[PDB]
Design a protein around this ligand. Sequence first.
Ligand code: 64K
Ligand code: 64K
Ligand code: 64K
Ligand code: 64K
Lengths: 140, 140
Amino acid sequence: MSLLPVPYTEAASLSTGSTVTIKGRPLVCFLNEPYLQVDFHTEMKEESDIVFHFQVCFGRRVVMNSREYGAWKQQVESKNMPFQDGQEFELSISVLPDKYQVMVNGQSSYTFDHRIKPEAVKMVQVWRDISLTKFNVSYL
Amino acid sequence: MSLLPVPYTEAASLSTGSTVTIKGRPLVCFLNEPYLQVDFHTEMKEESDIVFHFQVCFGRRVVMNSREYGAWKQQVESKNMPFQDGQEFELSISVLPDKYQVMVNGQSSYTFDHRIKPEAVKMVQVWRDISLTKFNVSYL
Ligand SMILES: O[C@H]1[C@H](O)[C@@H](O)OC[C@H]1O
Ligand SMILES: O[C@H]1[C@H](O)[C@@H](O)OC[C@H]1O
Ligand SMILES: O[C@H]1[C@H](O)[C@@H](O)OC[C@H]1O
Ligand SMILES: O[C@H]1[C@H](O)[C@@H](O)OC[C@H]1O
Protein backbone atom coordinates (compact mmCIF):
# COMPACT_ATOMS: atom_id res chain seq x y z
CA MET A 1 0.00 0.00 0.00
CA SER A 2 1.02 3.73 0.39
CA LEU A 3 4.80 4.62 0.33
CA LEU A 4 6.21 6.44 3.44
CA PRO A 5 8.63 9.42 3.01
CA VAL A 6 12.36 8.36 2.75
CA PRO A 7 14.31 9.49 4.66
CA TYR A 8 11.72 8.38 7.30
CA THR A 9 11.98 9.90 10.84
CA GLU A 10 9.74 8.78 13.78
CA ALA A 11 10.06 9.74 17.50
CA ALA A 12 10.45 6.50 19.55
CA SER A 13 11.00 5.05 23.06
CA LEU A 14 12.62 1.59 23.42
CA SER A 15 13.15 -0.81 26.35
CA THR A 16 13.68 -4.60 26.74
CA GLY A 17 10.81 -6.23 24.74
CA SER A 18 10.39 -3.37 22.16
CA THR A 19 10.41 -4.37 18.44
CA VAL A 20 10.90 -2.00 15.45
CA THR A 21 9.41 -3.57 12.25
CA ILE A 22 10.22 -2.22 8.74
CA LYS A 23 8.83 -3.43 5.37
CA GLY A 24 10.59 -1.98 2.30
CA ARG A 25 12.22 -2.74 -1.07
CA PRO A 26 15.69 -1.87 -2.47
CA LEU A 27 15.19 0.91 -5.13
CA VAL A 28 17.56 -0.89 -7.60
CA CYS A 29 19.33 -4.23 -8.36
CA PHE A 30 22.05 -5.56 -5.95
CA LEU A 31 24.68 -5.23 -8.80
CA ASN A 32 24.42 -1.41 -8.19
CA GLU A 33 24.94 -1.76 -4.34
CA PRO A 34 21.89 0.12 -2.97
CA TYR A 35 22.19 0.86 0.81
CA LEU A 36 19.68 0.68 3.69
CA GLN A 37 20.36 2.54 6.95
CA VAL A 38 18.41 2.38 10.25
CA ASP A 39 19.76 4.66 13.03
CA PHE A 40 18.50 4.77 16.70
CA HIS A 41 19.21 8.42 17.76
CA THR A 42 19.40 10.02 21.27
CA GLU A 43 17.55 13.16 19.97
CA MET A 44 15.11 14.15 17.17
CA LYS A 45 18.02 16.04 15.40
CA GLU A 46 19.78 13.93 12.64
CA GLU A 47 23.24 15.10 13.92
CA SER A 48 22.43 13.55 17.38
CA ASP A 49 24.36 10.56 18.77
CA ILE A 50 23.45 7.08 17.46
CA VAL A 51 22.86 4.26 20.02
CA PHE A 52 22.50 1.71 17.14
CA HIS A 53 23.69 2.24 13.52
CA PHE A 54 22.66 -0.51 11.01
CA GLN A 55 23.88 -0.06 7.41
CA VAL A 56 23.30 -2.72 4.69
CA CYS A 57 25.29 -2.63 1.43
CA PHE A 58 22.81 -4.98 -0.37
CA GLY A 59 24.50 -8.14 -1.74
CA ARG A 60 27.91 -7.23 -0.13
CA ARG A 61 27.97 -6.62 3.71
CA VAL A 62 26.41 -5.05 6.86
CA VAL A 63 28.25 -2.75 9.33
CA MET A 64 26.94 -1.76 12.77
CA ASN A 65 28.29 0.96 15.08
CA SER A 66 27.44 3.67 17.60
CA ARG A 67 28.21 7.38 17.30
CA GLU A 68 28.95 8.78 20.79
CA TYR A 69 29.51 12.55 21.47
CA GLY A 70 29.82 13.04 17.66
CA ALA A 71 32.48 10.26 17.22
CA TRP A 72 32.06 6.84 15.53
CA LYS A 73 33.09 3.87 17.74
CA GLN A 74 34.28 0.28 16.92
CA GLN A 75 32.66 -0.90 13.63
CA VAL A 76 31.19 -4.46 13.68
CA GLU A 77 31.12 -6.00 10.13
CA SER A 78 28.96 -8.95 8.93
CA LYS A 79 29.09 -10.63 5.47
CA ASN A 80 25.70 -12.29 6.32
CA MET A 81 23.26 -11.35 3.46
CA PRO A 82 19.75 -12.90 3.85
CA PHE A 83 18.22 -10.06 1.70
CA GLN A 84 17.17 -11.24 -1.79
CA ASP A 85 17.94 -9.29 -5.03
CA GLY A 86 14.83 -7.36 -6.22
CA GLN A 87 12.61 -8.60 -3.29
CA GLU A 88 10.57 -6.81 -0.61
CA PHE A 89 12.17 -7.47 2.85
CA GLU A 90 10.69 -7.46 6.38
CA LEU A 91 13.29 -6.24 8.93
CA SER A 92 12.49 -6.38 12.68
CA ILE A 93 14.90 -5.12 15.41
CA SER A 94 14.09 -6.65 18.85
CA VAL A 95 15.52 -5.01 22.03
CA LEU A 96 16.71 -7.99 24.17
CA PRO A 97 18.24 -7.44 27.67
CA ASP A 98 21.89 -7.40 26.43
CA LYS A 99 21.60 -6.64 22.65
CA TYR A 100 19.48 -5.70 19.60
CA GLN A 101 18.45 -8.75 17.52
CA VAL A 102 17.89 -8.11 13.76
CA MET A 103 15.49 -10.56 12.00
CA VAL A 104 15.38 -10.54 8.14
CA ASN A 105 12.27 -12.29 6.68
CA GLY A 106 11.74 -13.93 10.11
CA GLN A 107 15.38 -15.25 10.30
CA SER A 108 17.89 -14.22 13.08
CA SER A 109 20.62 -12.48 11.01
CA TYR A 110 22.54 -9.87 13.18
CA THR A 111 23.07 -9.01 16.87
CA PHE A 112 24.70 -5.94 18.51
CA ASP A 113 25.39 -5.70 22.27
CA HIS A 114 23.98 -2.55 23.95
CA ARG A 115 26.74 0.12 24.27
CA ILE A 116 24.17 2.67 25.64
CA LYS A 117 20.88 1.69 27.41
CA PRO A 118 18.02 1.65 24.82
CA GLU A 119 16.08 4.11 27.10
CA ALA A 120 18.54 6.76 25.61
CA VAL A 121 16.74 6.43 22.19
CA LYS A 122 14.29 9.27 21.26
CA MET A 123 14.21 8.85 17.42
CA VAL A 124 14.50 6.20 14.64
CA GLN A 125 15.49 7.22 11.06
CA VAL A 126 15.25 4.81 8.09
CA TRP A 127 16.98 6.05 4.91
CA ARG A 128 19.10 5.56 1.74
CA ASP A 129 18.18 3.58 -1.36
CA ILE A 130 14.84 1.93 -0.32
CA SER A 131 11.08 2.40 -0.66
CA LEU A 132 9.19 1.96 2.68
CA THR A 133 5.61 0.52 3.06
CA LYS A 134 5.60 -0.32 6.84
CA PHE A 135 7.20 1.24 9.97
CA ASN A 136 5.98 0.08 13.43
CA VAL A 137 7.40 0.18 17.00
CA SER A 138 5.63 -2.41 19.27
CA TYR A 139 6.07 -4.28 22.62
CA LEU A 140 5.74 -7.72 24.34
CA MET B 1 12.46 25.32 -8.48
CA SER B 2 10.74 21.88 -9.04
CA LEU B 3 12.50 18.70 -7.66
CA LEU B 4 13.37 15.94 -10.24
CA PRO B 5 12.72 12.23 -9.39
CA VAL B 6 15.70 10.53 -7.54
CA PRO B 7 16.89 8.09 -8.71
CA TYR B 8 17.03 10.22 -11.92
CA THR B 9 17.54 8.38 -15.28
CA GLU B 10 18.02 10.23 -18.65
CA ALA B 11 19.00 8.73 -22.05
CA ALA B 12 22.23 10.48 -23.25
CA SER B 13 24.90 10.59 -25.99
CA LEU B 14 28.39 11.94 -25.14
CA SER B 15 31.47 12.86 -27.22
CA THR B 16 34.51 15.18 -26.76
CA GLY B 17 33.02 18.61 -25.79
CA SER B 18 29.84 17.24 -24.07
CA THR B 19 29.09 18.54 -20.52
CA VAL B 20 26.64 16.97 -18.00
CA THR B 21 25.52 19.61 -15.42
CA ILE B 22 23.78 18.65 -12.12
CA LYS B 23 22.41 21.01 -9.41
CA GLY B 24 21.36 19.26 -6.17
CA ARG B 25 21.60 19.25 -2.36
CA PRO B 26 22.66 16.51 0.12
CA LEU B 27 19.45 15.26 1.90
CA VAL B 28 21.20 15.36 5.35
CA CYS B 29 24.27 16.70 7.25
CA PHE B 30 27.81 15.44 6.32
CA LEU B 31 28.15 13.89 9.88
CA ASN B 32 25.65 11.21 8.61
CA GLU B 33 27.70 10.50 5.37
CA PRO B 34 25.04 10.97 2.65
CA TYR B 35 26.19 9.64 -0.79
CA LEU B 36 25.84 11.00 -4.34
CA GLN B 37 26.27 8.67 -7.34
CA VAL B 38 26.42 9.58 -11.07
CA ASP B 39 26.81 6.58 -13.44
CA PHE B 40 27.36 6.77 -17.27
CA HIS B 41 25.77 3.48 -18.55
CA THR B 42 26.16 1.64 -21.91
CA GLU B 43 22.38 0.82 -21.95
CA MET B 44 19.10 2.19 -20.50
CA LYS B 45 18.97 -0.85 -18.07
CA GLU B 46 20.45 -0.07 -14.55
CA GLU B 47 22.33 -3.45 -14.56
CA SER B 48 24.20 -2.33 -17.77
CA ASP B 49 27.96 -1.69 -17.81
CA ILE B 50 29.22 1.65 -16.42
CA VAL B 51 31.74 3.67 -18.52
CA PHE B 52 32.12 6.21 -15.65
CA HIS B 53 31.11 5.60 -11.98
CA PHE B 54 31.35 8.68 -9.66
CA GLN B 55 30.42 8.11 -5.98
CA VAL B 56 30.79 10.86 -3.31
CA CYS B 57 30.73 9.98 0.40
CA PHE B 58 30.06 13.63 1.45
CA GLY B 59 32.72 14.99 3.86
CA ARG B 60 34.89 11.78 3.56
CA ARG B 61 35.99 10.69 0.00
CA VAL B 62 35.16 10.10 -3.72
CA VAL B 63 35.73 6.81 -5.61
CA MET B 64 35.56 6.43 -9.40
CA ASN B 65 35.48 3.19 -11.41
CA SER B 66 34.10 1.40 -14.47
CA ARG B 67 31.96 -1.75 -14.48
CA GLU B 68 32.84 -3.82 -17.60
CA TYR B 69 30.92 -7.03 -18.59
CA GLY B 70 29.31 -6.98 -15.10
CA ALA B 71 32.69 -6.69 -13.23
CA TRP B 72 34.07 -3.67 -11.30
CA LYS B 73 37.58 -2.57 -12.44
CA GLN B 74 40.43 -0.65 -10.66
CA GLN B 75 38.93 1.82 -8.11
CA VAL B 76 40.42 5.37 -8.16
CA GLU B 77 40.04 7.10 -4.72
CA SER B 78 40.20 10.87 -3.99
CA LYS B 79 40.08 12.55 -0.53
CA ASN B 80 39.38 15.90 -2.35
CA MET B 81 36.11 17.31 -0.84
CA PRO B 82 35.08 20.73 -2.30
CA PHE B 83 31.38 20.05 -1.39
CA GLN B 84 30.16 22.17 1.57
CA ASP B 85 28.09 20.75 4.49
CA GLY B 86 24.36 21.65 4.06
CA GLN B 87 24.93 23.57 0.75
CA GLU B 88 23.47 23.22 -2.77
CA PHE B 89 26.26 22.07 -5.18
CA GLU B 90 26.69 22.50 -8.96
CA LEU B 91 28.49 19.46 -10.47
CA SER B 92 29.53 19.50 -14.16
CA ILE B 93 31.25 16.53 -15.92
CA SER B 94 33.10 17.64 -19.11
CA VAL B 95 34.13 14.99 -21.71
CA LEU B 96 37.71 15.99 -22.72
CA PRO B 97 39.66 14.01 -25.39
CA ASP B 98 41.46 11.73 -22.87
CA LYS B 99 39.30 11.96 -19.67
CA TYR B 100 36.15 13.21 -17.86
CA GLN B 101 36.75 16.44 -15.89
CA VAL B 102 34.52 16.95 -12.79
CA MET B 103 33.97 20.61 -11.73
CA VAL B 104 32.40 21.29 -8.26
CA ASN B 105 31.05 24.88 -7.86
CA GLY B 106 33.14 25.87 -10.92
CA GLN B 107 36.40 24.34 -9.47
CA SER B 108 38.36 21.47 -11.19
CA SER B 109 38.12 18.70 -8.54
CA TYR B 110 38.41 15.18 -10.18
CA THR B 111 39.59 13.61 -13.47
CA PHE B 112 39.18 10.04 -14.82
CA ASP B 113 40.91 8.80 -18.01
CA HIS B 114 38.55 7.21 -20.58
CA ARG B 115 38.61 3.37 -20.23
CA ILE B 116 35.81 3.04 -22.87
CA LYS B 117 35.08 5.68 -25.59
CA PRO B 118 32.30 8.05 -24.34
CA GLU B 119 30.30 7.21 -27.55
CA ALA B 120 29.50 3.88 -25.67
CA VAL B 121 27.26 5.87 -23.20
CA LYS B 122 23.44 5.62 -23.76
CA MET B 123 22.20 6.59 -20.23
CA VAL B 124 23.08 8.75 -17.17
CA GLN B 125 21.64 7.92 -13.71
CA VAL B 126 21.96 10.30 -10.71
CA TRP B 127 21.00 8.74 -7.35
CA ARG B 128 21.44 8.17 -3.58
CA ASP B 129 21.00 10.71 -0.80
CA ILE B 130 20.39 13.99 -2.77
CA SER B 131 17.57 16.24 -3.99
CA LEU B 132 17.98 17.29 -7.68
CA THR B 133 16.83 20.69 -9.18
CA LYS B 134 18.85 20.70 -12.48
CA PHE B 135 20.01 17.99 -14.96
CA ASN B 136 21.36 19.09 -18.39
CA VAL B 137 23.57 17.50 -21.10
CA SER B 138 25.07 20.21 -23.43
CA TYR B 139 27.90 20.72 -26.01
CA LEU B 140 30.67 23.15 -27.15
O1 64K C 1 29.19 3.42 8.84
C1 64K C 1 30.06 4.15 9.73
C2 64K C 1 31.18 3.25 10.21
O2 64K C 1 30.62 2.21 11.01
C3 64K C 1 32.26 4.01 10.98
O3 64K C 1 33.32 3.17 11.46
O4 64K C 1 32.83 4.96 10.08
C4 64K C 1 31.88 5.96 9.73
C5 64K C 1 30.66 5.38 9.03
O5 64K C 1 31.05 5.07 7.68
O1 64K D 1 23.71 -15.52 12.56
C1 64K D 1 23.28 -14.55 13.52
C2 64K D 1 22.61 -15.28 14.68
O2 64K D 1 21.36 -15.85 14.28
C3 64K D 1 22.36 -14.33 15.84
O3 64K D 1 21.68 -15.00 16.93
O4 64K D 1 23.64 -13.82 16.22
C4 64K D 1 24.24 -12.96 15.24
C5 64K D 1 24.48 -13.67 13.91
O5 64K D 1 25.71 -14.42 13.98
O1 64K E 1 31.98 1.80 -5.79
C1 64K E 1 32.38 0.54 -6.38
C2 64K E 1 33.89 0.36 -6.24
O2 64K E 1 34.54 1.36 -7.02
C3 64K E 1 34.35 -1.04 -6.65
O3 64K E 1 35.76 -1.22 -6.53
O4 64K E 1 33.72 -1.96 -5.76
C4 64K E 1 32.32 -1.99 -5.97
C5 64K E 1 31.66 -0.63 -5.70
O5 64K E 1 31.60 -0.46 -4.28
O1 64K F 1 42.71 18.57 -8.27
C1 64K F 1 42.16 18.01 -9.46
C2 64K F 1 42.68 18.81 -10.66
O2 64K F 1 42.12 20.12 -10.69
C3 64K F 1 42.33 18.10 -11.96
O3 64K F 1 42.77 18.87 -13.11
O4 64K F 1 42.93 16.81 -11.89
C4 64K F 1 42.36 15.94 -10.91
C5 64K F 1 42.48 16.50 -9.49
O5 64K F 1 43.78 16.21 -8.96
